Amino acid sequence: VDRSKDQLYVGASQSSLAYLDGSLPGDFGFDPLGLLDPVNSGGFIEPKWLQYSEVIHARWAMLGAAGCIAPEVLGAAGLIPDATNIKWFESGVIPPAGSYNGYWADPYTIFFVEIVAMQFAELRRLQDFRYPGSMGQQYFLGLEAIFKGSGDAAYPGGPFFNLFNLGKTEAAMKELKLKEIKNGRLAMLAMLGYGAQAVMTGKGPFQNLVEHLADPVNNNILTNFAG
């Protein structure tokens, strides 16, 4: 996967150029396994679902990448009490790695609210993919006015999801989508970096960066194989 920008990436192949025509955001021709070929597609391996899933992964990853390091950066700057300067994997998500006592409820009590809240958010989002525009019809406390969608599942738009109606022009919107995808793809790799770095070193993402800057040669992946 060619880093940076370019017309085509390293893995671009003549076979993938058949259907990759630049219509999708961040379409750099990289599809060595040819999972986006329209011909004889079905199930979840089809262009509409795979492109939709990438954006959803991009947006969750962007929140995760910024949220898995902010407590360490803010804690390092003294803007939050040291009691909350906690590594992302020691928040309580993985109790064996570490858990934080001091939340207003037991982490399982909080999880049930997460289940119910995400059931509504995710199943309503799904129903717009299966039946476009269907969430703007049945009464939902008057909120159905903002759930009418825009025909494209990954980009609902509307009064809320496009609060400040940025990208009014077609050219402007394409650039914003490209910027969203590149930041999202970068964050997805960052999250994978957090997970791999946590296992290899056992420290937070911020600690690894600080140590690397201290002695870059003596602190890197190669030296962390043994300690």
Partner: protein, 213 residues
Amino acid sequence: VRPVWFPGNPPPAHLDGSLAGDYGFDPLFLGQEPQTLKWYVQAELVHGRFAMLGAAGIILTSIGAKVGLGFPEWYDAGKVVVEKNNIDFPTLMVIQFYLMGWAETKRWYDFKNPGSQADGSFLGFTEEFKGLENGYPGGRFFDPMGLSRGDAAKYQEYKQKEVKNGRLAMIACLGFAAQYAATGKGPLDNLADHLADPNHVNFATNGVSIPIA
């Protein structure tokens, strides 16, 4: 058009909204056959109506227990009533099935042959057992106030109210059983505990509902 249990999913063909409380919820297509749907429509109402009596009775007696009037919990009333009043349980059970058997057999053969119980055979009563709809007896015995014989628009509104309070009562009666099994305390004993510390006293912390907790 009309709201459904799963927004965005078209309602089933066999559920057209004519029935009360119809939200097009039949994922297993149990009532696809029209004649079987009549049987279940009445089964739901009988289940719902009993649950409403059960829930109201359990709630009221629980309030009596908390206030200290001496009522036993719903899960101990049966033993207390029999012993305190010196009642032979097998005799009381038999009496119940004679009265329920007679009353409920009449409802059974009105479903099979509607209007058959209003032929004057039973003590000469010829109009109190005719029946209005499936599951809605009507008449001046089951509906003495004639709220089903007055305004037609409001009577349809009540049918909506009856089924939804019935479904809510049915869920509540399942809550009473599940809560007692998990906690071993009365209904309002659980409510008092939750109000004390809602964050730290609920099903996620009882040590039973979520074993991995």
